[PDB]
């Protein structure tokens with residue numbers, strides 16, 4: 001079983017006070033707090049084992065630590081091979097890498113690409129720049145009122161010119177989990193590849209990219225209780241070894257000549273130019289170990305119970321509008337009466353409750369719902385029923401005071 | 404005055420043992436060790452102040468810490484304005500950013516770009532990919548035997564079609580410091596812009612980009628006694644606010660619409676997509692503080708004396724070939740007799756002496772000297788006369804044993 005009190009003991013930030021009051025951090029979807037095991041694994045590497053990667057001993061051990069983290073990450077998402085994983089800055093850079101290296105040589109004038117109306121900007125803007133570069137069309141799967149995809153529109157959007165579906169696994173605003181396996185079957189029937197944005201999935205339940213059969217999969221370390229500046233791009237081996245490089249420089253070359261040109265090295269490493277973020281890679285590996293030791297199924301069970309408790313308690317908040325489906329994961333998007341989200345979040349911060357307010361990097365989603373902004377509370381593995389009670393009580397107080 | 408013993412006390416890695424013997428780390432040019440003040444500033448941020456950047460309190464304080472580091476970095480290199488600095492992964496990503504955002508809209512078919520024969524691959528490969536994309540020509544300033552540029556060839560290389568000179572401040576192999584101010588005057592007389600690769604300069608002496616009048620300047624945090632995964636790209640305000648975005652996604656947009664297109668936000672931030680590497684940014688700011696507190700002029704004086712001692716002592720090594728000028732900064736590139744550098748570096752590692760062997764991401768430089776590889780010892784602010792003595796003695800032993 002899961003013990004939230006033992007877990008919280010690993011997270012030093014949770015002891016913090018904000019505005020004189022004890023912090024209730026309900027913004028893990030924007031970025032997750034990190035346990036001491038992750039923080040110290042990075043610090044200890046800098047303290048005792050630091051060197052540049054790729055003869056001498058510290059450098060050879062550091063190179064081996066980084067390839068071990070690549071292997072551990074590939075097992076964490078059940079990729080066939082460690083060499084199907086590229087180290088990137090985060091989800092955003094991973095998507096841009098695919099959009100340029102794979103997009104520029106596989107999406108031509110007159111083609112189309114399909115995204116959804118709930119996509120994070122990370123999974124919109126690189127496809128808009130790709131379509132502008134090659135003269136292709138960006139198609140959009142629209143939303144239902146309850147925050148799910150209008151799956152009936154897929155036949156009018158998929159045709160023989162559809163090169164790619166780029167789709168979120170779990171919405172960072174609505175908490176909707178999309179039916180990826182079926183959508184990927186449909187997409188593959190047309191010869192379309194599928195990129196999955198998994199930035200909000202990998203911390204809530206197990207993820208298996210062989211079962212999903214996605215062609216690309218991306219996520220960020222810092223939302224997986226890990227350090228900033230590191231993330232993972234998974235690509236099917238057969239596609240990856242055909243993709244050209246994106247960033248150029250050291251470590252991604254085989255030979256460099258000023259008169260005979262330059263040749264590239266083999267995949268993953270062809271896509272990793274310059275000094276890797278070894279500090280972040282070390283912290284990411286520790287983050288995967290820590291999460292695996294708790295067990296993603298145990299995390300999923302505790303988070304689902306906490307979510308059901310929260311949705312039940314929030315029924316006692318007058319004039320509360322929720323957005324998204326009842327079976328959401330991770331986040332609760334809401335607005336309080338007619339009050340602007342900025343004001344609501346500001347009162348909640350004043351009680352020491354951290355929630356995010358604004359467009360959540362999902363402006364088309366906001367426009368679909370005809371609001372400028374939303375509040376969002378995240379309910380992660382280290383959050384408690386008591387913090388939910390503080391959120392409920394605070395919204396009630398804000399309603400009485402401002403109503 | 405400088406006290407190397409007090410400085411070394413800040414660096415926990417220096418206590419390490421390698422192969423049972425005390426470490427002599429002479430590979431700071433590949434990556435620098437970090438002081439506790441840098442390591443702990445990052446750890447403490449994760450422990451007590453962590454949040455996503457850009458209403459609630461932790462997030463507002465984190466956003467302010469990152470913009471303070473941007474300001475501190477701009478003062479460190481004497482840029483006019485903090486908004487002339489873009490946070491990048493490192494030198495390599497900074498150069499690729501310029502090559503794509505600025506290069507693609509300013510270098511056309513039939514134009515030419517000038518680099519030097521001593522450039523790191525980071526400052527070659529992105530210009531080769533740019534020239535291949537737009538149909539331009541890559542011109543090369545050749546070397547003199549002593550490791551300096553053949554400055555006489557500049558009139559045959561600069562013409563009216565020269566769009567850009569990309570040039571290293573200090574060679575990572577030879578330790579040559581190039582006459583940047585004069586070369587930038589010449590380049591500007593033709594309407595050419597100048598990118599300076601400063602990755603080997605910013606830790607050895609003060610750097611002033613207003614005095615240099617360079618148009619772009621790049622360096623890496625991890626060689627500046629800082630964390631991995633962070634670096635700085637400086638661009639003159641007038642050029643930067645004309646440059647289009649490179650990576651797309653959150654935080655670099657002003658508005659995102661699926662029907663009316665997307666607009667971009669103002670410079671620096673237009674070039675920073677997705678979650679910044681706040682952990683690395685915090686560590687970088689601490690690294691700049693630590694180096695400023697020692698004083699770059701004090702570092703330069705101690706490192707120059709250590710270098711003169713090393714070059715004098717190495718005269719007692721039979722069959723030692725040195726590469727580069729006598730007034731080198733930071734590094735000593737050498738080969739021992741006819742022995743391959745890999746073997747020499749392997750014996751030195753066995754004595755607990757870390758040097759780098761290989762092409763040092765400078766294959767054209769190696770070919771100029773008609774060798775496949777070189778050894779390189781770095782002499783940084785925390786290295787000692789005693790470690791030089793260990794290097795000298797070790798090379799002597801290797802010569803006797805293998806000669």
Ligand SMILES: [Cl-]
Pocket residue numbers: 249250251252253524764765
């Ligand atoms: Cl290389």
Ligand SMILES: [Cl-]
Pocket residue numbers: 121361362652653654655656
């Ligand atoms: Cl945004």
